[PDB]
Amino acid sequence: GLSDGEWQQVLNVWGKVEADIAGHGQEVLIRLFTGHPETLEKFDKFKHLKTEAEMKASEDLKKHGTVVLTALGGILKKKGHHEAELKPLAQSHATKHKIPIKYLEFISDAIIHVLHSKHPGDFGADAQGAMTKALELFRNDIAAKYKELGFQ
Ligand code: HEM
């Protein structure tokens, strides 16, 4: 549950992402894959990537980063009223992709890391607080759908 002022912070931060969605999306996925190599194994189309240089050179990885952040941005712009947008993603990630909630924690922290890396000194403590709460809400509502489905 976020206040209006917290949502305003989230959507202000998101403007930084929308200025370069593919570059942010690329770095988020690279941070996930390099920090948690078991996550790469869930992607049949990226498992061939052995080095970070290959990851950086991959145009399909940048494309998928755009898909991921476009979906997340659409959810964030709903300011918590995201049941219709979140349900299909929860269902596909639990039932088709088999993504444990832990990996959603990993990608949430990766987003925070990338924001500080690309905007050092320009991602203030209030902005980090609000973005973290928004990603916690996203993860928590996914977790509720995972429990419904019995998925671990
Ligand atoms: C911010 C969190 C994330 C969002 C918004 C997101 C969004 C998406 C979207 C929009 C798709 C394509 C449509 C679909 O299949 O439902 C997708 C596919 C997928 N996602 Fe995610 N995802 C997230 C996190 C993750 C994580 C952490 C993993 C694994 C570690 C993952 C694994 C996958 C896989 C394996 C696919 C299919 C890729 C392919 O072969 O085309 N997702 N995701």
From Swiss-Prot:
Q: What is its EC number?
A: 1.7.-.-, 1.11.1.-
User: Known SUPFAM superfamilies for this protein?
Assistant: Globin-like
Tell me the protein's name: Myoglobin
On assembly, the entry states: Monomeric.
Modified sites of kind Phosphoserine: S3
Q: Pfam families recorded for this chain?
A: Globin (PF00042)
Q: Where is nitrite annotated to bind?
A: H64
Q: Which GO terms describe its molecular function?
A: heme binding; metal ion binding; nitrite reductase activity; oxygen binding; oxygen carrier activity; peroxidase activity
Q: What keywords are annotated for this sequence in UniProt? A: Cytoplasm, Heme, Iron, Metal-binding, Muscle protein, Oxidoreductase, Oxygen transport, Phosphoprotein, Transport
